């Protein structure tokens, strides 16, 4: 996670391979391994990829150099130095050359040719075609770049009118008109490009990111959207991301929805950004799950695969989020059965029961530390995420199958598990189950055990206590009520929730011996100041309770004291310093 350490290690290893003056296969393999690990760790800005490409080229490995060009083009959009580095490479080639270099040139054109600095790519491709007899292809390339706005576009038009000396005027109107519109668009974007080039340099300041000029350029690009402005928008988003602010991608999300580009181009954007953008951010990711579930409307196994794998990644990088297992289980119930209620009654119940069996056998293996790679759910289920899985087993068993006894059996079986022992949806589903069946006896025992044994959060506790107070007032009567208080302990369904609301540990205990054991309790030792336990002096036998009329009978005994040595002794266990600052 340290960039300067990996840079110092790369420079030291490379200076070891060069300073050693030999190939030094240990140092060469060490340099390659360090480069691969650093590339796996980091986004590999153009400079270190240039140094790594130079080092691999010095070692002279052709195929390995072909792979590191594709891995260099893996992380970047807008780099013409890597593409031109491959065309300079791949310009020296073998039996597949002719078609190989035009493939790399054509793909590099698909990517970076719409950029403002992109003139050298068109120059190199025109030079590569001019090296051949391909002059038709050179005229095609010359006609293609004239339609795009570039910095040097005028000099390119004059070079085309110059080397065009054979076929030059062949089509004058289309070429001159397209060149004129391209010049107008270039003149229009010259103000944004000027505000850019007058902004970006590294001060380690907002100038370096040029976030303001990038925001204005993206705003001008999105509102004035015409033709290639999809590829202009992607190019501008890429160049903006090259300097990890995700409100830029969060600007692009609406840009591709409004301009109506096909789903194939949009899903790849989020597939690249989810990897690019750092972990722990997690807004556009959920919006991408929502995009997949939304585009599922037109049914494609592609979106089901992208969803299943994407959830497989996010659940690994975020194990604690429970929403992912609810979404994934919803899509598993959805795409893998699809009853549609046109079928036979015996068929749909089979499709439900099969789901129940896969789910029960899934959690049964998950608790026993047995994993079946054939069932994908087994990979996803987690110690935190097992809860809602059992919960949807309950819900499907009781609601869909109308089987009550199996369901109550599942409550007892799964009530003692340590993982789902404390669960919000499990005990809310039990609260809704014991609400549906109207019996209060189970549900009273539910709410009186809620602070002692079954531990939920306090906001949810207030919720069960209030909602059950209302439910009990509405659906019960007095004859049921007054029979319901044992009186061994003080408990009433109307009043007790009101005393227990903000207090999870409230115990209605009636005892006189709490008076005898008093003043040794931490609540006494800290009273006016919390967290700090003083020992406070007091008179053992104190008269302030006895009225002065009752004192005159007998002479008052002398005061007996206690805790009188400790008046200046005030102790604090410091729990912030020693368990956090000290670690």
């Amino acid at each position: 996670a340290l960039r300067g350490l990996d840079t110092q290690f790369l420079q030291d290893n490379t200076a070891l391979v060069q300073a050693y003056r030999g190939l030094d296969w240990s140092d060469i393999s060490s340099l390659t391994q360090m480069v691969d690990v650093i590339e796996q760790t980091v986004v590999k800005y153009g400079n270190p990829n240039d140094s790594i490409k130079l080092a691999l080229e010095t070692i002279l490995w052709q195929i390995l150099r072909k792979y590191p060009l594709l891995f260099g083009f893996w992380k970047r959009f807008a780099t013409i130095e890597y593409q031109l580095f491959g065309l300079k490479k791949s310009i020296a080639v073998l039996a597949t050359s002719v078609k190989w270099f035009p493939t790399s040139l054509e793909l590099w054109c698909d990517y970076l040719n719409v950029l403002c600095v992109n003139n050298p790519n068109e120059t190199d491709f025109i030079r590569n075609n001019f090296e051949i007899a391909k002059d038709l292809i050179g005229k095609q390339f010359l006609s293609h770049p004239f339609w795009d706005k570039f910095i040097e576009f005028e000099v390119g038009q004059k070079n085309w009118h110059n080397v065009q000396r054979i076929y030059e005027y062949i089509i004058e109107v289309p070429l001159h008109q397209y060149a004129r519109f391209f010049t107008s668009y270039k003149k229009f974007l010259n103000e944004k490009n000027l505000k850019t080039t007058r902004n970006i340099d590294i001060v380690l300041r907002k100038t370096q990111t040029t976030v303001n000029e990038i925001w204005q350029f993206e705003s001008k690009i999105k509102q004035p959207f015409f033709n290639l402005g999809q590829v202009l928008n992607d190019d501008l988003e890429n160049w903006s991301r090259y300097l990890y602010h995700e409100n830029t991608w969060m600007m692009y999300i609406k840009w591709l929805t409004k301009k109506n580009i096909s789903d194939e181009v949009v899903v790849d954007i989020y597939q690249k950004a989810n990897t690019f953008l750092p972990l722990d951010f997690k807004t556009l990711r959920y919006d991408f799950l929502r995009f997949l579930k939304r585009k599922y409307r037109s049914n494609n196994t592609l979106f089901n695969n992208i969803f299943n794998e994407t959830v497989s990644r996010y659940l690994k990088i975020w194990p604690n989020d429970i929403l992912l297992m609810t979404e994934y289980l919803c899509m598993l119930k959805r795409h893998s059965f699809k009853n549609s209620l046109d079928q036979s009654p015996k068929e749909i119940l089979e499709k439900q029961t099969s789901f129940t069996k896969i789910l029960e056998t899934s959690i049964t293996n998950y608790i026993n530390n047995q994993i079946d790679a054939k069932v994908h759910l087994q990979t996803l289920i987690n110690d935190k995420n097992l809860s809602i899985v059992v919960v949807e087993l309950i819900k499907t068993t009781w609601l869909v199958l109308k089987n009550n006894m199996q369901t109550r059996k599942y409550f007892n079986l799964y009530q003692k598990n340590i993982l789902i022992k404390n669960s919000v949806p499990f005990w809310l589903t039990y609260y809704k189950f014991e609400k549906s069946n109207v019996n209060f006896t189970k549900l009273n025992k539910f709410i009186r055990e809620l602070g002692v044994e079954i531990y939920l959060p306090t906001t949810v506790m207030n919720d069960i206590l209030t909602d059950y107070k209302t439910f009990y007032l509405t659906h019960s009567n007095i004859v049921t009520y007054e029979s319901s208080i044992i009186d061994s302990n003080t408990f009433d369904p109307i009043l007790y929730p009101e005393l227990k609301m903000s207090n999870p540990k409230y115990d209605p205990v009636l005892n006189t011996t709490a008076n005898v054991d008093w003043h040794k309790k931490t609540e006494w030792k800290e009273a006016g100041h919390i967290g700090i336990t003083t020992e406070r002096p007091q008179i053992s036998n104190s008269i302030i309770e006895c009225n002065s009329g009752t004192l005159i009978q007998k002479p008052i005994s002398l005061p007996n004291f206690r805790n009188l040595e400790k008046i200046n002794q005030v102790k604090i266990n410091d729990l912030y310093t020693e368990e956090f600052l000290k670690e």
């Binding site: 604690n320 429970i322 809310l428 531990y455 306090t458 919720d463 609540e523 919390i530 410091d574 912030y576």
Partner: protein, 161 residues
């Protein structure tokens, strides 16, 4: 309030669920890998009500041990001193500049035009989860109960936790 002894299986939105009812929160952070978080309220009465309210209360089957502790920036100012063992001069939290006749400490605005009577019984001002809002006594109860009945239906099916 520094809350130590967590399970580190717990999220921050779950911890908010624990410490929400004791009062309005201006939250700080929960450290990663340190298995101890901390919370911050607006008023000390709510803080003490949370410390006395939850002490030894298990979260994910771990008895929680919580006491007083500072915020993130003062934590940084301390940790830079712990290595250089120099001073560790504390700086107390800012006060509320107190008169305030409209605010009733340890009270929450459960959700978001109000022209009120500004009478004593009602809660005039309040905080938002950073915007000072005037609390409407009639609409606040129906809003809080609305979010209460939503939290059950979303909570049972796994959306809210």
């Amino acid at each position: 309030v520094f809350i130590g002894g967590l399970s580190s299986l717990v999220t921050e939105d779950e911890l908010r669920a624990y410490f929400q009812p004791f009062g309005t929160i201006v939250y700080v952070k929960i450290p990663v890998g340190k298995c101890c978080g901390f919370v911050q309220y607006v008023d000390r009465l709510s803080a003490e009500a949370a410390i006395a309210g939850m002490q030894g209360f298990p979260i994910a089957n771990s008895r929680v041990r919580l006491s007083w502790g500072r915020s993130a920036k003062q934590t940084a100012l301390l940790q830079q001193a712990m290595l250089s063992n120099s001073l560790q001069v504390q700086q107390q939290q800012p006060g509320l500049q107190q008169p305030n006749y409209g605010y009733i400490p340890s009270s929450t605005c459960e959700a978001p035009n109000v022209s009120s009577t500004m009478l004593p019984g009602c809660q005039i001002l309040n905080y938002s989860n950073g915007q000072q809002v005037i609390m409407q006594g009639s609409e606040a109860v129906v809003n809080s109960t609305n979010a209460m009945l939503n939290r059950l239906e979303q909570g049972s099916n796994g959306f809210m936790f």
